[PDB]
Structures are given as structure tokens and as C-alpha cells.
């Protein structure tokens, strides 16, 4: 798809990943296309029906042919492996982005069949929605309250796992303001289909502050583990929710629940 | 030698290096000693003169013997290679020492058949002598004004090369105050034997300040490249010299002489 999520990304990491996919595709084509072409060519040209076709029922080894067969795959794998090493060392989710703007910290707790997000610096909490200004690095600290999940925003870039009692780091920056879809890429149970959220890349900071202020006006507060556990009850297709007051160290307590 | 320079060191780096030498010696003995013992044993016991000795003129292969022969060297090399990796990554001269006291920077320019030292922080210069307080890290920035040399203080620890237009880093700490000998470990020409200096590990800081003040009282000054070049004249068995006033960036100018 020309207008696909991965082939038309909006995040930087998405852009380098798309470039890498296209370069890899190009490198593999140079060997794959001849294989299929020669398959069809040798099937048609050298059929039993043809009389003019050269018949060689004792030509069973060729040093030239074997050398050509071995060499080209080796060279293609060498080039693509050098590219793989460079990109893998340059696209590690556990690596801070190089940008002037200070990164915004978001904590992602993965409850059963819903998504929970905490802004500790802003001191707010959300369910099935996030917001961050465009052209600003975003630092995700992702953990699971329960069964393994996978935090993923296809348009922005790379995914990661959420596991109980383990913090995993991720970095994402949005080049174009707008609304992007976010899903879970690891089957967590019956309500796994339910896990869906929206990432709002605001055109400017002021819109982000307005969204934070709107979240601050929520009557609901997340100040104690009892309220967290009450929210953590098994539920399906949870609507977008807001919480004004957040415990200073909630992510730490969620991880320490499993003593890790 | 029990009272040898390397087997009775005074520096820390010397101590870990001696420990490593002894551990390696021990590991290699377990295989080497049996080789020589079996050589002498099989030479004596199975000589042509003996009649009771078992004669096997067709026993030419043994799976058990071959397995034993291959295995033990492999295991010894595996253990000593793990030790080698750990020590090599832990004894790199280009690595700052872990200690409370701030390291003292010494610049080591290697003139033809003599040693030159600069204290930039103290702003003094010396020929064929250094001083530093005991139990204090010392950071050597070593270069050669001419032909390759090798900065080396056997008792303190590791050596390094001095090459034209290249700065090389080294770290040394002295556990016991006293006078230690320092030589060149790379043949630089006829006057190579001449290259000899003394490292004075003072019992306390106050003695080091007294030595620095004594060096400050030298009538001679090293303020320009002309004076440096005048000193850099080919000379042999140069006596200990002092220089009060030093150009702020002399080491930089010495390296930039070769445009590197």
C-alpha cells in the first residue's frame, strides 16, 4: 500500500525503518527475481516437447556455475548484514533521540484489556489516550500490570513488550501533527482486540498544556494503590478516562508489586 | 628474583600484573610439568636396554589418549583466555584509575637520548626527573619529539610507546613512597642507553609542593619554541634540569609540529 501506515509514516523512526525496508527489498530483488525468471525460462524453453533445445544428460557439475551460485548470495548477505549492524545499533528503542527539545516522560502500565498512561512531570493519568507536542522526543517507560502485552504505534515507529515487574524503554518523535492509532501486538486474552488508543501530536505546546489542564479538571483521582486496583478490575473496551491527582511514585509501586 | 622489580612491585598496576603473571604461571604448570616429567620417564623406563618394559610396535592410535591430549590444553586455554579478557579490559593504560584523590597530569615529551616532563597545572618543566605524592593517581600524556621511544617505570607498572605527533595516555599510582628507576624500552639510537630518570613518590603533598617550589627557583625558562629546539639539540647522558616558566600550551605545539 502506497498510503499504508509503514510505507507512509509520520514519525522519524518510521522514516529510517521504511528506508531500511526499501533498501533490503532492493538488495534481495537482484537475486530473487532472476531465480523465478530462470525457473519459468527453464520450465518453458527446455520442455520435453522442444526438439531444438540442447540435451546434456551427463553434464552434472560445473566449477564456474558453482562459483557464481555461491558468490552472489554471500556478497548480498555481507552488504545487507553491514547495513543490518549499522541500523540495529542506530535504531535501538533503549536509546535517547538526538534533538534540541527535552524529552517528555510517559509511563505505560498495561492493565488487562486496557491501556493506562501516567505523566509524572505533569502529574496526570489517562486511560486509552495520550498527547504530546509535535517535533518533540517522547520517552516511554512501559510495564505490564498483568500478562505480557506489546506497546505499538505503527505510524510513529518501533514497538516493545510490556512484562510484569519489568520497565522497558522506548523513544518516539512525531514530525507531523495529528491523530495516530495505537494497538497491542501481543495476544493477552479475550479482550485483546479491545486494546486500542489514540496518540494526539498537537501542532504546538499550548494545545498540549490545554489538554493537560482539561485532564487536570477530571473529578477522579489516582492517589492510592486501592484506587489503582479498583481500576485494574478485568474490563473490556474501556472508554477514554482522565485522573487529576497521581501518587508521585506509582510506576515504581506497580513494578515493586512483583518485588523486582 | 624474590626481590625483583616486577615480583616485588610498589605500584597498584604492578600488583595486579604480578598476580596475573603468577596465576598464568600456575595454570600453565599443570600441563607443562607433566610433559617434561613424561619425556624423562618414557626416555628412562622404555629404553632399548630394559627387557621387562612392554613392547607395542603396532599400537599406533588411541581414542582415549587422543581425547585426553586434546581436552586439557583446550580447558586451560579457555580459563586463561577468560582471565586474559577480564585483565586486559581492566588493565588498559588508556583508562582512568578509581581513587578519591584527583589525578595529577604529567606531559612526557621524548627528545633524542633524553626525557622531558611538563607539569602544566603547576606550570614547571624537568629533564630526567619527575615527582608526585604517594597514593595519588598520575595521568601521563606521552609523545615523542623524534624517533619512537617507550616510557616505562618497571616497579610502578605498565609501559607505553612515544611516537611523533601522537599523544598516548597512561595511568600509574604508587602505594609506597620512595625513589624508582625509569628507562626507555624502545631502541632510539646510540644514546638510547643514556635515557634514565628517577620517579620520586613523596611521603606527603607538602614534600611535592617543596619540590615544585625548588623547580620554580630555576633561573632557566621554557617560554618559546626556540628555547625548546635549543634544548632538543642531540645530546647524550643529559643531567637532571629544571625550568620555572612554561608556555601554557607547549605539548599541543610539540604535537602540531608534525601537523597531527
Amino acid at each position: 500500500g502506497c498510503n499504508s501506515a509503514l510505507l507512509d509514516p509520520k514519525g522519524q523512526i518510521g522514516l529510517e525503518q521504511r528506508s531500511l525496508i526499501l533498501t533490503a527489498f532492493g538488495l534481495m530483488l537482484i537475486v530473487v527475481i532472476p531465480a523465478i525468471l530462470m525457473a519459468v525460462g527453464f520450465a518453458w524453453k527446455y520442455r520435453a516437447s522442444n526438439k531444438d533445445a540442447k540435451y546434456s544428460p551427463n553434464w552434472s557439475h560445473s566449477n564456474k556455475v558453482e562459483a557464481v551460485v555461491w558468490t552472489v548470495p554471500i556478497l548480498i548477505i555481507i552488504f545487507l548484514a553491514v547495513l543490518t549492524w549499522k541500523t540495529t545499533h542506530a535504531l535501538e528503542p533503549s536509546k535517547p533521540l538526538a534533538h534540541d527539545e527535552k524529552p517528555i516522560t510517559i509511563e505505560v502500565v498495561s492493565m488487562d484489556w486496557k491501556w493506562f498512561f501516567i505523566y509524572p512531570e505533569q502529574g496526570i493519568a489517562t486511560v486509552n489516550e495520550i498527547a504530546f507536542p509535535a517535533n518533540t522526543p517522547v520517552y516511554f517507560k512501559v510495564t505490564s500490570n498483568s500478562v505480557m502485552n506489546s506497546f505499538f504505534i505503527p505510524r510513529l515507529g518501533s514497538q516493545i513488550y510490556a512484562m510484569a515487574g519489568m520497565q522497558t524503554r522506548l523513544h518516539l518523535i512525531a514530525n507531523e501533527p495529528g491523530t495516530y492509532d495505537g494497538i497491542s501486538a501481543s495476544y493477552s486474552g479475550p479482550g485483546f482486540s479491545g486494546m486500542k488508543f489514540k496518540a494526539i501530536a498537537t501542532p504546538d505546546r499550548a494545545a498540549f498544556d490545554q489538554w493537560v489542564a482539561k485532564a487536570k479538571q477530571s473529578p477522579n483521582t489516582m492517589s492510592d494503590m486501592a484506587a489503582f486496583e479498583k481500576l485494574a478490575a478485568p474490563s473490556e473496551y474501556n472508554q477514554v478516562e482522565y485522573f487529576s491527582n497521581v501518587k508521585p511514585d506509582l510506576f515504581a509501586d506497580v513494578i515493586n508489586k512483583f518485588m523486582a | 628474583g624474590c626481590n625483583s622489580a616486577l615480583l616485588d612491585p610498589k605500584g597498584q598496576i604492578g600488583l595486579e600484573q604480578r598476580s596475573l603473571i603468577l596465576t598464568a604461571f600456575g595454570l600453565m604448570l599443570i600441563v607443562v610439568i607433566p610433559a617434561i616429567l613424561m619425556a624423562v620417564g618414557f626416555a628412562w623406563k622404555y629404553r632399548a636396554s630394559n627387557k621387562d618394559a612392554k613392547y607395542s610396535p603396532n599400537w599406533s592410535h588411541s581414542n582415549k589418549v587422543e581425547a585426553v591430549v586434546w581436552t586439557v590444553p583446550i580447558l586451560i586455554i579457555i580459563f586463561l583466555a577468560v582471565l586474559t579478557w577480564k585483565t586486559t579490559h581492566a588493565l588498559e593504560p588508556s583508562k582512568p584509575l578509581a581513587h578519591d584523590e584527583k589525578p595529577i597530569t604529567i606531559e612526557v615529551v621524548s627528545m633524542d637520548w633524553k626525557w622531558f616532563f611538563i607539569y602544566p597545572e603547576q606550570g614547571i618543566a624537568t629533564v630526567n626527573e619527575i615527582a608526585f605524592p604517594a597514593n595519588t593517581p598520575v595521568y601521563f600524556k606521552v609523545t615523542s619529539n623524534s624517533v619512537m621511544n617507550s616510557f616505562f617505570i618497571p616497579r610502578l607498572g605498565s609501559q607505553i610507546y612515544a611516537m611523533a605527533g601522537m599523544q598516548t595516555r597512561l595511568h600509574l599510582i604508587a602505594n609506597e613512597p620512595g625513589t624508582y628507576d625509569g628507562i626507555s624500552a624502545s631502541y632510539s639510537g646510540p644514546g638510547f642507553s643514556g635515557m634514565k630518570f628517577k620517579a620520586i613518590a613523596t611521603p606527603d603533598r607538602a614534600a611535592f609542593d617543596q619540590w615544585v617550589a625548588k623547580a620554580k627557583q630555576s633561573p632557566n625558562t621554557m617560554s618559546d619554541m626556540a628555547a625548546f629546539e635549543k634544548l632538543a639539540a642531540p645530546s647524550e647522558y643529559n643531567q637532571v634540569e629544571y625550568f620555572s616558566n612554561v608556555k601554557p600550551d607547549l605539548f599541543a605545539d610539540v604535537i602540531n609540529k608534525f601537523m597531527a
Partner: protein, 658 residues
């Protein structure tokens, strides 16, 4: 007559060099006088000086190596005496200007013109005989290689006579050996000597590599060859894959010295470190070239004198192949103190440690070859036992030195010299003497005196221990290499002990000379009648003790590992063939010595900047090569009559002796 050459190029004032020159020139004049008096000029010219034959070129390599060993050991004695006198707070008798020349020349001679000539001599002597071939693939190439080695030797010796030698160590590190810091002509002597010797050695490597694979006796598969042939093949592979690195490195240094380029200069963006890397990229394979064949020799001896089949043939051949493969990825272990990253130092340390396993496997295979055999205490067997005992300690110290932590204080210290001298004396020269005494009957037809041989071996081993064990302690005490004047008195005692060791080794060398003399004197009583003196396993012992210029009248058929042992066991060892056939052989060629003389002139002119003479020499070389490329009468046919006569004489000797 032109260039830097003048009356001031010869050192009139210095007495030591003048008395050395007088000794050499009177020796040469006496030898020429004796040859003229006996009138053997013609015999040497047609049978020795210009012989394609492999055995003659092998014996002549042995002669060159032996005569150069005397000069090398004289330099060793002079250095040890100078160090001993300097330690006692005396000025000594060798100025640094002479000491530097002496140690550089000693290193170069003892590496390039003592070890390699002797080893390649042994290869030329036995490898063609063992594989069951009549000659080598390229006989004229072998003759040319010999003469190129002789040219290198001549240039090194004449360096003493006129001008000076290099004062930059035996490898000539760039910044000291540059035109800025070494204005002398010594480095040019070093350059051209090593260049021509390297060309010769590369040609030798190619020749042997082709000979071993292509000219094997029919029915002898790769895994049925004697172990020495395997070791020789591995060494020649190393020569082919290594010596180009030396050629290119020396060519780059001589370009820097002549055309004023900036390859290794400290200024104008030259990278000096590069040279060191390149030379050591060549440096470390070289030592295995010295140690692989001698291993084979010991294996052969271990087979012959234990009176039982060699243990772990497959293990030995796989171990030598592993050594050959691993000897290209370990060179950086020479300069851990250069200041490379922890990763690179650790990796190169580990890979240098890995190559220890195959050598240990080979030593254990020899030990288990001696396990339940009947061991005869011959000279060769004593050399083998001494080699095992010494080389174990050498290898121990080596693997200790291979750790970067230990190398950070033991590098360029007398511990390193103790290591390399220990392993060289343990393996190379021990295998050299063992092979010389083991293959002497196949070269001349008589045996060596056993008493003098045993005396020489005992003197060598005891002297080596006494001379080099104190160097371990001195290395530990922090005394570095190449010290000449005002040596720290604390190093006196050990050095004095080393001096004692030196004179002990001297007696050994003297013993060796005496041995050869008496072996020549009493040849009529110690003749090898049967052609099988020690009951050797390999095909080489099937022939008469003087082998005919054709190795075999009929090329032998091989079915098993030890061909000659199986032939003796089956009871068909000396059977008269039904009929003999005309044998195709190569003619003796005189162009090798002409090309050698032209190369000597070219090299000498290049050293002394005589441009026209160098052009004349190079043109002479190319013209001689082109002219010899024209003639087609290079081979002849040995008739049935001569072959039948020699075979009948040999069989009569067998019958009378048997």
C-alpha cells in the same frame, strides 16, 4: 667509483673490523689457493656450482648456514663480552656506533641466513626423495633461489668490508631507519639483502608447493605422505602467503629512503605505525616457517628411533594445518604496548593463546610415540628429547608473554629475548643438527662420529640453559634489550653467568666442527653399505647411501603410510627389476650464477647510488633471463646401460653387506 663510495667508506682506524676483514680475506685466499692446488675448479663448476639436482643445493644451503652460524655466534660472543664489561662500570671495547651494527647484523644473519638456509637445505635434501620423485618441479628455479640467497649473504658480509651496516635493529622500524635519522648506507644494505633473499625464498616456496602436490609417487594419497612432507607443504604455503608482505614493506621503506616519499615519515601525513603492522603481518608467519619443518624432522626421528609406528598421524597433520591457518590472525601480539583498544588487544591475545593447543597436541603425540617403543639413545634421539624438554619451557614462557597484562611489563625486556632465543634454540637449531646427523649418510654415504655428536649436544643444551635462564631473571628485574653503555651494576652477576653460558655454547660449536672433521677423516670405516642405517620408515632409505642424480631407477608403487617399512615387512625390499628404461632428466644450467652476479652488482650500485652501474646490472639480469628463455636443449636422456651399472653395483653392495 662514483656515488657515495670513496677511500673513507672503509674503516682504516677501527682495529676490530680490520682484523675481522683480514681473517675473512685470508680465509678466502687460502680456500681459493687449496681449490687451485687440487685443481677441482672444473668439478665444482659442472657438479656443484651449477647443479639443478636438489641434494647438491640442499648440501650447499647446509654449508652456507654453517659458515654464517660462525659469524652470527662471533657477534653473539662480542655483544655478551661488551655487556659483561659494561656491567662492571667499565667503558668496555665496543662503542654504541659498533654495538648497534653488531646486534642488527647478528639478528639479520641468524634469522635470514642461518635458520632458513639450513631448513630449506633439509627440504631440498629429503622432500623429493620422501614423495618418491626424481627431482623438483622447477630445478633451474631452485638453483636461482640458492644463488639469490648467496647474493644476500655476500651483500651482508661485504657491508662490514665497505661502508657500515644498519643501526636500527633487525627489522628497521621506520622513524629511526628513515632518511632523516639514518643518513648512513647500512639501511640500504639491509633493504637490498632482504629484498633479494625474499625473492629467492618466494621462488623456493612456489617450487616446493608445486613439487609436493604434482610430483607424488603413484598410489601415495595425501593422507599417506610422511609427516615431514606435510610440515614442508605447510611451511611453503606460509612462505607463498607471507613473503610478498616483506617484499612490499621493504619496497615502501626504500621508496621513502630514495625518492623522499612520506609512507612512514613522522611528518607530511605519513603513518609510521603502518610499517610495524606490515612487518609483523609478515614477521609472525616467518617463525612458523622456521618451526614447522623441524617438527616434521622430530616426528620422523620419533618414528625411526622408537622402533614403532608414529602415534596420531591424523592428529599431527590436522594440528600442523590448524597452526598454518591460525598463524595469519595473531601478529598484533608483537605490539600490545602500541596503545590499541582493550577489545583489539584482548582478541589478539586470545587468538595467540589458541595456537598453543596444536603444538601441545604434537608434543603429546611424540611423547606417546616414545610410550611403549624401544628407544635407542642416538645423537638424533638425544636432540629430540632435549628439544621436547626445552621447547615445553619456551612455549610456557610464550603463552605467559601472550597475555597483554604480562606483556605490558615483559615487552622488549630480556624476558622476551629469553623467550625467542629459548624457542629458536629448542626447536630450529636442535631440529637442524638432528636432521643433519640423521640424514648425513643420505648426503655423503658415511655416518657422523657419535662421541663428538653427544659431547656437542650436551655442551649446547647445558650452555643454552646457563646462558638464557639468567635472561628470564634480568627481564623480571626490568633490564631492557639493546643496552651497551653504563649498564646498572645490579644486572652484573646474571650477565656474568650468561657470559659463562656463551663460552659453553662456543665449546659445543667447536665440538660440532671437530665431529665433522673426524667424520670426514674416518669415512672409510663408517660407510653406510645397505642404504638403511637406522631402519627408517620412509622411501628415502630405499636408495643407496650416495643417491644417484636420478633418485629412483623405477618410481616406487606405494599402498600404505610407511612405504619402506611395509616393503621390508612384506619381504620385497631389494628386488631386481626385469628391465630398466631411459630416464628423462634436466641438464645443468650456468645462468643462475650469472643472474646472481648481475643482481649483486645491481644491489651494490643501488646501495652506493651508482645509477649507471645499477642500470647495467638490471639490464644484464633481464638480458640473461631473456637469452636463457630462447634455448630449448634444457633436458637429456639417461641410457639403460648407466642405470643398470649403478643398480648392479648397489645390489652387489647389498648382497656382500647382507
Amino acid at each position: 667509483m662514483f656515488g657515495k663510495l670513496s677511500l673513507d667508506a672503509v674503516p682504516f682506524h677501527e682495529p676490530i673490523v680490520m682484523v675481522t676483514i683480514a681473517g675473512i680475506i685470508l680465509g678466502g685466499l687460502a680456500l681459493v689457493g687449496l681449490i687451485t692446488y687440487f685443481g677441482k675448479w672444473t668439478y665444482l663448476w659442472k657438479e656443484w656450482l651449477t647443479s639443478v639436482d636438489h641434494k647438491r643445493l640442499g648440501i650447499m644451503y647446509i654449508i652456507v648456514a654453517i659458515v654464517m652460524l660462525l659469524r652470527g655466534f662471533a657477534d653473539a660472543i662480542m655483544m655478551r663480552s661488551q655487556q659483561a664489561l659494561a656491567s662492571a662500570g667499565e667503558a668496555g671495547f665496543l662503542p654504541p656506533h659498533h654495538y648497534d651494527q653488531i646486534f642488527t647484523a647478528h639478528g639479520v644473519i641468524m634469522i635470514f641466513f642461518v635458520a632458513m638456509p639450513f631448513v630449506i637445505g633439509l627440504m631440498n635434501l629429503v622432500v623429493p626423495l620422501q614423495i618418491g620423485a626424481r627431482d623438483v618441479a622447477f630445478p633451474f628455479l631452485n638453483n636461482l633461489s640458492f644463488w639469490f640467497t648467496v647474493v644476500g649473504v655476500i651483500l651482508v658480509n661485504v657491508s662490514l668490508g665497505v661502508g657500515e651496516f644498519a643501526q636500527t635493529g633487525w627489522l628497521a622500524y621506520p622513524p629511526l631507519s628513515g632518511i632523516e635519522y639514518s643518513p648512513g648506507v647500512g639501511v640500504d644494505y639491509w633493504i637490498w639483502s632482504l629484498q633479494l633473499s625474499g625473492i629467492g625464498t618466494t621462488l623456493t616456496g612456489i617450487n616446493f608447493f608445486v613439487t609436493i602436490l604434482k610430483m607424488r609417487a603413484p598410489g601415495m594419497t595425501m593422507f599417506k605422505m610422511p609427516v615431514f612432507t606435510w610440515a614442508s607443504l605447510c611451511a611453503n604455503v606460509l612462505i607463498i602467503a607471507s613473503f610478498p608482505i616483506l617484499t612490499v614493506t621493504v619496497a615502501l621503506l626504500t621508496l621513502d629512503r630514495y625518492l623522499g616519499t612520506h609512507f612512514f615519515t613522522n611528518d607530511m601525513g605519513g603513518n609510521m605505525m603502518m610499517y610495524i603492522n606490515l612487518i609483523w603481518a609478515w614477521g609472525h608467519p616467518e617463525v612458523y616457517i622456521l618451526i614447522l619443518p623441524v617438527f616434521g624432522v622430530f616426528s620422523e626421528i620419533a618414528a625411526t628411533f622408537s622402533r614403532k609406528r608414529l602415534f596420531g598421524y591424523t592428529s599431527l597433520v590436522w594440528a600442523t594445518v590448524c597452526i598454518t591457518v591460525l598463524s595469519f590472525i595473531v601478529w598484533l601480539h608483537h605490539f600490545f604496548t602500541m596503545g590499541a583498544g582493550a577489545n583489539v588487544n584482548a582478541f589478539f591475545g586470545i587468538t595467540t593463546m589458541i595456537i598453543a593447543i596444536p603444538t601441545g597436541v604434537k608434543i603429546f603425540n611424540w611423547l606417546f610415540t616414545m610410550y611403549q617403543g624401544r628407544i635407542v639413545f642416538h645423537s638424533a634421539m638425544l636432540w629430540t628429547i632435549g628439544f621436547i624438554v626445552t621447547f615445553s619451557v619456551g612455549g610456557m614462557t610464550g603463552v605467559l608473554l601472550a597475555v597483554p597484562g604480562a606483556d605490558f611489563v615483559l615487552h622488549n625486556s630480556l624476558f622476551l629475548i629469553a623467550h625467542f632465543h629459548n624457542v629458536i634454540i629448542g626447536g630450529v637449531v636442535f631440529g637442524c643438527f638432528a636432521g643433519m646427523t640423521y640424514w648425513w649418510p643420505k648426503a655423503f654415504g658415511f655416518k657422523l662420529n657419535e662421541t663428538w655428536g653427544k659431547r656437542a649436544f650436551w655442551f649446547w643444551i647445558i650452555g643454552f640453559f646457563v646462558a638464557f635462564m639468567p635472561l628470564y631473571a634480568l627481564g623480571f628485574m626490568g633490564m631492557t634489550r639493546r643496552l651497551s653503555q653504563q649498564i646498572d651494576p645490579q644486572f652484573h652477576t646474571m650477565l656474568m653467568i650468561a657470559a659463562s653460558g656463551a663460552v659453553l655454547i662456543a665449546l659445543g660449536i667447536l665440538c660440532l666442527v671437530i665431529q665433522m672433521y673426524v667424520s670426514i677423516r674416518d669415512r672409510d670405516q663408517n660407510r653406510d653399505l645397505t642404504g638403511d642405517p637406522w631402519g627408517g620408515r620412509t622411501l628415502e632409505w630405499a636408495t643407496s647411501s650416495p643417491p644417484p642424480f636420478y633418485n629412483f631407477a623405477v618410481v616406487p608403487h606405494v599402498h600404505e603410510r610407511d612405504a619402506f617399512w611395509e616393503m621390508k615387512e612384506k619381504g620385497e625390499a631389494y628386488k631386481k627389476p626385469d628391465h630398466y628404461e631411459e630416464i628423462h632428466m634436466p641438464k645443468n644450467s650456468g645462468a643462475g650464477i650469472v643472474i646472481a652476479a648481475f643482481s649483486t652488482i645491481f644491489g651494490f650500485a643501488m646501495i652506493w647510488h651508482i645509477w649507471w652501474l645499477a642500470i647495467v646490472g638490471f639490464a644484464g639480469m633481464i638480458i640473461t633471463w631473456i637469452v636463457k628463455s630462447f634455448d630449448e636443449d634444457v633436458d637429456y636422456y639417461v641410457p639403460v646401460a648407466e642405470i643398470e651399472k649403478l643398480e648392479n653395483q648397489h645390489f652387489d653392495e647389498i648382497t656382500k653387506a647382507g
